[PDB]
Curated annotation (Swiss-Prot), chain B:
Source organism of this protein record: Escherichia coli (strain K12)
Family: Belongs to the universal ribosomal protein uS4 family.
Protein name: Small ribosomal subunit protein uS4
SUPFAM superfamilies for the chain: Alpha-L RNA-binding motif
One GO MF term attached to the UniProt entry: structural constituent of ribosome
This protein's GO CC annotations: cytoplasm; cytosol; cytosolic small ribosomal subunit; small ribosomal subunit
Role of this protein: One of two assembly initiator proteins for the 30S subunit, it binds directly to 16S rRNA where it nucleates assembly of the body of the 30S subunit.
Gene label: rpsD
Curated annotation (Swiss-Prot), chain C:
Regions that span the bilayer: none
UniProt key word Chloroplast: no
Job of this protein: Binds as a heterodimer with protein bS6 to the central domain of the 16S rRNA, where it helps stabilize the platform of the 30S subunit.
Ribonucleoprotein is among the record's keywords: yes
Protein name listed in UniProt: Small ribosomal subunit protein bS18
Organism annotation: Escherichia coli (strain K12)
PROSITE patterns: RIBOSOMAL_S18
Swiss-Prot record, chain E:
Classification via InterPro entries: Ribosomal_bS16 (IPR000307), Ribosomal_bS16_CS (IPR020592), Ribosomal_bS16_dom_sf (IPR023803)
One cellular component term from this protein's GO annotations in UniProt: cytosolic small ribosomal subunit
Role of this protein: In addition to being a ribosomal protein, S16 also has a cation-dependent endonuclease activity. In-frame fusions with the ribosome maturation factor rimM suppress mutations in the latter (probably due to increased rimM expression) and are found in translationally active 70S ribosomes.
GO molecular function terms listed in the Swiss-Prot or TrEMBL record: DNA endonuclease activity; four-way junction DNA binding; structural constituent of ribosome
GO biological process assignments: cytoplasmic translation; ribosomal small subunit assembly
Keywords: Endonuclease, Hydrolase, Nuclease, Ribonucleoprotein, Ribosomal protein
Entries under SUPFAM superfamilies matching the protein: Ribosomal protein S16
Source organism (scientific name): Escherichia coli (strain K12)
Protein name, per record: Small ribosomal subunit protein bS16
Domain of life: Bacteria
UniProt cross-references to Pfam families, sorted A to Z: Ribosomal_S16
Curated annotation (Swiss-Prot), chain G:
Keyword Ribonucleoprotein: yes
Effect on the protein upon substituting H28P: In neamine-resistant mutant nea301
Organism: Escherichia coli (strain K12)
Gene: rpsQ
GO biological process entries: cytoplasmic translation; response to antibiotic; ribosomal small subunit assembly
Protein's UniProt name: Small ribosomal subunit protein uS17
Length: 150, 205, 65, 129, 82, 100, 80, 123
RNA sequence: CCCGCAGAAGAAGCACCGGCUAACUCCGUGCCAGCAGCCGCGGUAAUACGGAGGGUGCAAGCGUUAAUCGGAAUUACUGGGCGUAAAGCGCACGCAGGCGGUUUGUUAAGUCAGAUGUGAAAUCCCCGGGCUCAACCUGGGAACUGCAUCUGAUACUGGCAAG
């Protein structure tokens, strides 16, 4: 039930003594829809086994999100390798706005309205798992209270 | 300032019923609806993200018969208003006088309902109105002129309006052939399948 | 097992609708405690809630209304 | 030249929290103790003491809740290169309010959560997050 | 010659005849001193198309500002009550 | 001096006068030295079955600490006034101030 | 009291008047860095009292020459 | 990128001048074509493209690709300048408008009938 | 503006269809003719040329050109970098400038609070009213993020005196 959706499909190649053989990589993300997201990325010589490996890898290495009713808790900046990620909670009546590679991670997180802007690299493999940072190290009011005292 | 072409091809492109026919005959018998119009209509779409974005935009445009430039100010008025923008456009779209006439059922089609408003035949609050896109405020009593009263188009339209929902926010009365706009409809009242969130993200780019 | 013997519920609240949808068969009747495994204490306050919930029409009496 | 004695001290927290040390060690000034009180009453530190008279010193005992650091992202703002001066109303809320910004107002130094209802701003020193 | 002049601010064929403290040599729709009211000759069934503030105009004739014929019609239409 | 639970529904076409009613009702409890513990307006919620034909009535919830004679009069007031349909008055052991 | 400004006297040797350096600490409108922006104002005085290294308070008055529409009112710290 | 270096000298972004030096940013201009000729395009492609140099009435003498299937343009004729870079032919960044002044439209064209200066046939 | 005459009668074109970007097939052309905003298509099987059919997108307008902003965080104040992509002066001394340990007292410039005046009208936004609706006209508020003055606070920076 955890919102299976793909992101991008890419064709990568080898060079060998015979010549150039091809393979296909698939980008998918999954998540229950209440503060929990898993992402996957698999490779195969054909497209459907790559997505199969992608969703299967997505349904592991599970990372939870500290989440309110439909949106985040604070602005937080996410970086990874070359991509820089900006997220900002919005009003309840507002929908979600993001880039296409910034999109599908967010609906499977349960977030419904965030001002999301991608900075620097627009690489779909790189912007994903950069959005996971921010969600992964997110701070909630109740446990920072335990972190401090009140 | 209307599409005024063949109607079922518009329903054939969207694949569902768009209520541009009266309902006297089944739409399956009238057209081969299951595949898109044209020679290449039976093929798989594999439609893009912007494709289903656009298809949802044309869809809600084509039940209500509203052009794109008129659709944009409908969103712009919904954007400047408070509340959620998605149902606000749906609230603004339901305020059209030809749509109200169809929703109370004086018109067999909303194109037919538009002709009733255009041909000087609809009285609101004791005032005749020609403009089809007239926004109807709450507590407004729609009515018919002396002409088009007990005329054959408005009788046959009423008899096929019983089998529909008979919507809650309007008080239809076929005995004196009039009605009142009690409340603005909400999102829970109108068919529950219109992807109004796909509408917003097309005009947000 | 019974869900209500844990989670520390003092009494089953009729205004909580989401739990009651899981415990009513789609026709509208009350499922027994022999299926869910609810404690006999908590089934009694349970069954009063649907009778209370059906009164304000939050829950249908039958499926043929 | 050691040209911002404050901006050294927040890095002592940054280096102390990252290395998971027990205590940090830095010379003391009155403003140094002043924001040390602000870190105490928000629970970002446990205890601070002022020792010595000829060369006074400020001793801070850091915190480790689930073993990891308690201070996460601490940043000097009003630096000698560019001083930041804001009024009572445009004082930003840190971590959307879950964090705090200490601020040297005219009536004293405190968090942002103490200055806005008091109705006065001042030097935006840093945000503790 | 500081006067009490009547200006046209309305649309085409639908005049909204604004009354305004204006200098004599200035334009009809141009530079002025201050606003005291208006006059809408195509007003609805409801009467709000002609509003004057009686205090400001009284100070201006007390100051020495002459008024024209049409503004004289408006004060002597409202008189004191109606 | 006892805690009660009061829920009543409103005819949808009379939805505009509802803020007056709780304003009128709270003048009866607090006027009779009682107190209000929970106010919430559920809005026009669709019912599972139609009552007096009709669909999507307007629900109002209320938690009241009051003596019983005034709440007897409100029960008659629900009976007397047509705009309120399908009322229910209960009983709560303690005062409650919660969500849902 | 009246409107007056206080600045450092920048000259020493002008005939029965003086130029006074008004110094300000304004904010840069874009980058926000607080910088020293000084202005030099021609200031009148009788029989050339003040001199270099001095700080005076100056006031606005009618034009007596080109750029000299100000006159000092009182001197303080007449020493190096 | 220090702020102290920024107050001393502010940020400067280059103007990034126009692709086509059509004078005074006018959208069209007329001009007299001097020599009409053909040229071979850049390396990946190949054709015999119809191009002409044109002396504009502003004073400039620039080149321009004349479009369409065939033409009847000679020397000293006056044609309208449209714009648009032709990347296959280096040097020419301008187009002429078919069916305007001395320039004729394209014979018997149906698709893109507006953009090639052809009248609608009766239907 | 209202009433009556006759009858569907007097009234639909424009761009696109390889990807970006919504819509695919046939015929002729054969690195010719040509298309093209970028990637690139055409050298005898073109979803990219020209025509036809069909479809798509707008509509009394539709396209092309020109022009500004956005995307462009691609001059980065908010908000960029300088080992190998562009970028550390060949290296020092050093006037101006930028900045500066630490405590006491003074001052109130910067700074912060409050108050006053002003920031014309028109424009934008919000709540209303009228043209059969809308555009448009218009009432009231808000805003006008600024400026000057006056009175307070002295945490820090600044100035002064002393360590």
């Amino acid at each position: 039930e955890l919102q299976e959706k793909l992101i991008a499909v890419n064709r990568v190649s080898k060079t060998v003594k015979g010549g150039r053989i091809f393979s296909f990589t698939a980008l998918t993300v999954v998540g229950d829809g209440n503060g929990r997201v898993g992402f996957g990325y698999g490779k195969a010589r054909e497209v459907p086994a790559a997505i199969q490996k992608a969703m299967e890898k997505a349904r592991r290495n599970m990372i939870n999100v500290a989440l309110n009713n439909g949106t985040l808790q604070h602005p937080v900046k996410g970086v990874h390798t070359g991509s820089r990620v900006f997220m900002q909670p919005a009003s309840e009546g507002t929908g979600i706005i993001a880039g296409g590679a910034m999109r599908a991670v967010l609906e499977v997180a349960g977030v419904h309205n965030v001002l999301a802007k991608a900075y620097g690299s627009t690489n779909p493999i790189n912007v994903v798992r950069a959005t996971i940072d921010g969600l992964e190290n997110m701070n909630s009011p109740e446990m920072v209270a335990a972190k401090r005292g009140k | 300032a209307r599409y005024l072409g063949p109607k079922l091809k518009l329903s054939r492109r969207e694949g569902t019923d768009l209520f541009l026919k009266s309902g006297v005959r089944a739409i399956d018998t009238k057209c081969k609806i299951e595949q898109a119009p044209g020679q290449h209509g039976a093929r798989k779409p594999r439609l893009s993200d912007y494709g289903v974005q656009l298809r949802e935009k044309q869809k809600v445009r084509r039940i209500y018969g509203v052009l794109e430039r008129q659709f944009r100010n409908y969103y712009k008025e919904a954007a400047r208003l408070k509340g959620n923008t998605g149902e606000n456009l749906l609230a603004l779209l339901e305020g059209r006088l030809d749509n109200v006439v169809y929703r109370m059922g004086f018109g067999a089609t909303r194109a037919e309902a538009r002709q009733l408003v255009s041909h000087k035949a609809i009285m609101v609050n004791g005032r005749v109105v020609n403009i089809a896109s007239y926004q109807v405020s709450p507590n407004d009593v729609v009515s018919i002129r002396e002409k088009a009263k007990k005329q054959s188009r408005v009788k046959a339209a009423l008899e096929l309006a019983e089998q529909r929902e008979k919507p809650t926010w309007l008080e239809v009365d076929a005995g004196k052939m009039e009605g009142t706009f009690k409340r603005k409809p909400e999102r829970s009242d109108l068919s529950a399948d219109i992807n109004e969130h796909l509408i917003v993200e097309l005009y947000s780019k | 097992f019974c869900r209500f013997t844990a989670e520390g519920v003092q009494e089953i609240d009729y205004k909580d609708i989401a739990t009651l949808k899981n415990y009513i068969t789609e026709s509208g009747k009350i499922v027994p405690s022999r299926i869910t495994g609810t404690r006999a204490k908590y089934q009694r306050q349970l069954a009063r809630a649907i009778k209370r919930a059906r009164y304000l029409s939050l829950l249908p009496y039958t499926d043929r209304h | 030249s050691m040209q911002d004695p404050i901006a050294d001290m927040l890095t002592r927290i940054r280096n102390g929290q990252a290395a998971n040390k027990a205590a940090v060690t830095m010379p003391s000034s009155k403003l140094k103790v002043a924001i040390a009180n602000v870190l105490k009453e928000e629970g970002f530190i446990e205890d601070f003491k002022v020792e010595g008279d000829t060369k006074p010193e400020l001793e801070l005992t850091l915190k480790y809740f689930q073993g990891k650091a308690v201070v996460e992202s601490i940043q000097r703002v009003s630096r000698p290169g560019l001083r930041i001066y804001k009024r009572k109303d445009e004082l930003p809320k840190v971590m959307a309010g879950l964090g705090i910004a200490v601020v040297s107002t005219s009536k004293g130094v405190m968090t942002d959560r103490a200055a806005r209802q008091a109705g006065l701003g001042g030097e935006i020193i840093c945000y503790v997050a | 010659m500081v006067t009490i002049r009547l200006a046209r601010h309305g649309a085409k064929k639908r005049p909204f005849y604004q009354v305004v403290v204006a200098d004599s040599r200035n334009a009809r729709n141009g530079r002025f001193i201050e606003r005291v009211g208006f006059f809408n000759p195509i007003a609805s069934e409801k009467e709000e198309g002609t509003r004057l503030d009686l205090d400001r105009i009284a100070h201006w004739v007390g100051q020495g500002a002459t008024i024209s014929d049409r503004v004289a019609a408006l004060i002597k239409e409202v008189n004191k009550a109606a | 001096m006892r805690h009660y639970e009061i829920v009543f529904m409103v005819h949808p076409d009379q939805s505009e006068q509802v803020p007056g009613m709780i304003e009128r009702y709270t003048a009866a409890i607090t006027g009779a030295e009682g107190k209000i513990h929970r106010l919430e307006d559920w809005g026009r919620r669709q019912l599972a079955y139609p009552i007096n034909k009709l669909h999507k009535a307007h629900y109002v919830l209320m938690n009241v600490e009051a003596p019983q004679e005034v709440i007897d009069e409100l029960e008659t007031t629900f009976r007397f006034n047509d705009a309120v349909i399908r009322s229910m008055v209960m009983r709560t052991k303690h005062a409650v101030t919660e969500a849902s | 009291k009246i409107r007056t400004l206080q600045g450092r006297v920048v000259s020493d040797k002008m005939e029965k008047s003086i130029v006074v350096a008004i110094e300000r600490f304004v904010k840069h409108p874009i980058y926000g860095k607080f910088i020293k922006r000084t202005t030099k104002l021609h200031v009148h005085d009788e029989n050339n009292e003040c001199g270099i290294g001095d700080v005076v308070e100056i006031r606005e008055c009618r034009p007596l020459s080109k750029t000299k529409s100000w006159t000092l009112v009182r001197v303080v710290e007449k020493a190096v | 990128a220090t702020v102290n270096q920024l107050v001393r000298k502010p940020r400067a972004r280059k103007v990034a001048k126009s692709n086509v030096p059509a004078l005074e940013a006018c959208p069209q201009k007329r001009g007299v074509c001097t020599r009409v000729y053909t040229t071979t395009p850049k390396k990946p492609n190949s054709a015999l493209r119809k191009v002409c140099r044109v002396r504009l009435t502003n004073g400039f003498e620039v080149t321009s690709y004349i479009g369409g299937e065939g033409h009847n343009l000679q020397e000293h004729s006056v044609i309208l300048i449209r714009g648009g870079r032709v990347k296959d032919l280096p040097g020419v960044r301008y187009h002429t408008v078919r069916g305007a002044l001395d320039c004729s439209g394209v014979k018997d064209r149906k698709q893109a009938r507006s953009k090639y200066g052809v009248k609608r046939p009766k239907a």
